[model samples]
Target chain A: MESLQQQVAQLLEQQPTLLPAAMAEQLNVTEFDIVHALPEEMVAVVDGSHAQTILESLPEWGPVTTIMTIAGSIFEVKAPFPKGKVARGYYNLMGRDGELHGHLKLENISHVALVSKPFMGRESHYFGFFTAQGENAFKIYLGRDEKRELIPEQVARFKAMQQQHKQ
Target chain B: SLQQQVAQLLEQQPTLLPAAMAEQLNVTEFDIVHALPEEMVAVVDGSHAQTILESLPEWGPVTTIMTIAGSIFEVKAPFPKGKVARGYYNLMGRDGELHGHLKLENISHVALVSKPFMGRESHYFGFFTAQGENAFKIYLGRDEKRELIPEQVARFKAMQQQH
Candidate 1:
């Protein structure tokens, strides 16, 4: 039998755009496992300790989509990431002008995957935050420009962070 | 009248949560809030949702809750900032914050409620849809001592007066 990683690589070759979560279900593995087995060009695994630095960089990257699925509902917020600070055991968001504000338990984040993938026929890049149990916490996709293309500058920023924090 | 009878039951059992009151009285939650005494509740236009959300963050931490299909989802945090975009009030929150786009037009009324909850004095902003449905609610948070934060109460009253 082929190795899990080899199997993942083969599956991706056939279905190049399968989502990490769906792929995990099909392979009977965790989403992080699927992400971990992705092609080198499509994924870079980063230490969760750098999660704070990554979040801090997003405020200047302009608009992005923050997505979370709960109770059979997919909630997507397409707006600029807000600024936050460390307080009371969480990275607390304190954006006075931005749209979203809340507390993030950075301690719970065990891995951050800088993923470059094609989604719904569009080129996409996102950071997938996961827990020690390999459960996906949420994801933040880079924003788009007026032509509905990925913002090049934001893509550069994502790449820089991936290089800086890759494990 | 339904309102008269509901008010009498409330006067007798002052600490009943709205859901329980609605269930016992066989009415919708909106009807229960609407039947509240003039001083205990005030119905404001839903267009003020933007203004209300914008002002909430300044008041500090709150309990934003939604009950769907018999399940309750609660988030204890400051309301995120929002803007009108693509026909929705888009909430842009940081990590661990509640973020979602709200359809402002579907919200027909907002009830400023000063009622007791879980046997404690509580206040909340209840968003109501045009069909008399209760969308969600944001309740003032309590302190470590399990007491309602007074500053939020003052702010809630001030907002109630404005509406």
Candidate 2:
């Protein structure tokens, strides 16, 4: 119902933290339906064609949240994001310097999405990939600075990248 | 020994997916890494991704989503024809009830794990990695004959044998 869609949007306006996929469950709609509900200009869809490049550049972007989930459990690993490299036949993230570390199996990749919109405050932006069945594979975010402020520099980087793909 | 158990496990079920094995052992999936034989596990680096996910749809209807915690979000529908575009998996069910994306990076290992459920048998087959504190869990799909897809398995084996 159009009224239901409006109510969903109203709820989102009230609680910016609720992601489309998460909120879809509460509102009884598909994740795609939630995306469609939003004003067209607000949703800039980008194919994960360059997901590899997008992920590789995270370390320089500084400390951010890496979120992955497998059902009821959502694993949110926060670190400056240890650098990823290739070693011993594996593309490795020797997360030795930080708390979160692991080997990345890129070959397992099945889907990716880059959604840029203001959800958390005016500029809460993140892009991630998923496993399947709307199960979140992993999510990457731009971090807040020492003052717990969103990094302006990384914001520009994201904006520029999002724009580049649009062109 | 753990290695020997891996042999025994494989003997019983020649095709086991890692997630399934972990469930059978009642341990964190990553813990199964220790039980695996050297040949049973192999690590790899990945790059040609666009070329990779593009191949998922070919497997058709064998995709299964089992929940260790439980299915977070699901639609009990058949997986759709798949492709890579607009930065999503495009595995949307025809009814628009199911959809999502999977992005893999820096593959680290391939281990086949198996478990019998209720009555029928299935496996969580896909690429995995033993990179750091976590040995990542990955799942793709099974086949019409209820076997893990062959070509993907062969690719993982090739990646393992190369080094």
Candidate 3:
């Protein structure tokens, strides 16, 4: 399997809006090791009333958004208020009704390595990512490096998944 | 009219009579028993009198009448296992009804201490001797503290007296 950091990079590339400055800084660390991780394959839809409560109680980082999309086509994201200009381990991703349907914790990233894996039909490709964090929350990111440039094929796959969920 | 007046006078007198003297007066022991309206009666034969006296009523009212030949009536404390000191007569009826009777030895000092969680009113009564040793104590409840109604006190008293 692709290393977790590469998967996170790919996830971030898909949802560029989820990227915050602190996460970008942590991605630069080569000494950290994966602590824990969890991924949700299925998402539940929440109703509007609950969504409003969640939005209202949400820490004052930013307005809870029904429009921000995350991995698994699960949208409705609320970012944690920045603590000292850096978001910490806890954040909730909500559905339309503001129910927490997904979560992400980036503190789990420990080590990073470049690995080559088969892509599409042709040749093997190389990417940088970390090992799987344990069972806390899944880490997902877009596959763009510090250059802010998108990995074309990875971007295409993410767009395809989003499109498929939107339909 | 004269007989009724004499009877009334006799009832008011605090006379402790032996059996022969009580019978010679041509009245049952009850006639001279403290005529408190709130008094209740429990009859104990000779063998049971001391044991019954030792085990006084802890809750509710009772007046115990021991019939040796004539009879001796004493009010019991609301609780068992304590000597009655001054000012604390055997229990008495509140309103001409038999309350309860236990021995009240003398009138000295009495104290009420409540058990934990006994709420504001339920309490135990302590009777102190003149020197304050060998004190008598009993637990009792006010009407509100008891689970029974006024009507039920009589029935409960009857049930306990049977024992």
Candidate 4:
């Protein structure tokens, strides 16, 4: 079978630093497809794109880099993932700084993956989500603790889930 | 060249993390790995990675089990055999040695990273996986010496074609 994953990979290499959003629009696929094109070493695609599962899982990872862009602006945040429930239509990032704040919808999430790549505009490691047709919902980073160390149990669980729920 | 510069830097610190180097070099770790000397590495899919770990006990000792998501976790221990305990895959260490437990489902790919480090050559046998919540690269160390076990390297090279 001709793999779209293959196509996305080859195309992405031609422009490693290109804005994935623009490329998604240009390629007419979902942004998720573009990010998934990344090599396994740089990206991990989980079967369930569930935002809640992803959100709930982050308290364990210590410091993950976050990147966000609404409309034309770009913003990035780096810290531990915020643990909070979505109420009143917001995935509230329970961080002290307003840096990691954003708006996300539950219904729009179609797929999710853990990524560590260089988007054309934003090149950092992240766990981003997508809606059907490649629309991006938001990004939450894999965090590291104050010790500059990664949370082992959280990571073990994360990778385990990717395998258990291989989409 | 950035690759050469990286190689030069790694000569000083053998155990340096790739993620940390990526920031210093200002490039994605994706690019950092491919830039490694081709002769020093080989890539494999995660589906068949268990074989590599199985082969570990024979060579047979290990140094560490390192897992990296955005952050890196290192378990410095020897290679233990795999056994299922309570439905989870775990390494069964001989005698009283601590075993490394594996969440096998989360892996996506594996790489045999054999490169120069700490002013000498060493190797890192790694496994990979992803979660929507997080992702991981698990590396098992076999390089307590200047390089990986010669026989293991030979065995890997011998079977490289089929893989």
* Candidate of highest DockQ: 1
Quote the lDDT for A118 in model 1: 84
Question: Per-residue lDDT for A1-167 in model 2, tens only?
Answer: 55766876786778778887777787887555565466544544454445556668877887776655432223344456666675654446645423344555444444455556565566776765643344445667777665667888878887787677557
The reply for model 1, stretches above 4 Å from the true place, is B1-163
lDDT per residue for candidate 1 within A93-162, as digits (tens), equals 7644324545678888888899988898678899998888887877899987667888889998888866
Give lDDT for model 2. Answer: 0.52
Q: On residues B1-163, what C-alpha lDDT tens digit does candidate 2 reach at each position?
A: 6556565666467566455677787754555655665655553333433344454445443333323212122222234445655553334443322234444343344344334444544333334443422323334344445555666555545554562
TM-score, chain A only, candidate 3, equals 0.21
Summed over model 3, clashes come to 59
Give, for candidate 1 chain A, the lowest lDDT window spanning 10 residues: A68-77
Q: What is the TM-score (0 to 1) of candidate 3?
A: 0.16
lDDT of each: 0.76, 0.52, 0.30, 0.55
Full ranking by DockQ: 1, 2, 4, 3
For lDDT, the strongest prediction is: 1
**Clash totals for all candidate models:** 5, 24, 59, 21
> Which residue pairs in candidate 1 collide?
A99-B81, A99-B92, A100-B92, A100-B93, A101-B93
DockQ for each of the predicted structures, in order?
A: 0.09, 0.03, 0.01, 0.01
lDDT of 3 by residue, B59-79 (tens): 454322221111111222232
- Of candidates 3 and 2, the better by lDDT: 2
Judge candidate 1 at residue B71 and give its lDDT.
28
Question: By the TM-score metric, which is better: model 1 or model 2?
Answer: 1
Tens digit of lDDT per residue, candidate 4, span A1-167?
A: 44766766776677666656776776677787777765666666764446677677676665565544432322234455566667775545454322233344555666777765654344345567766666665566555566655556656665665565454
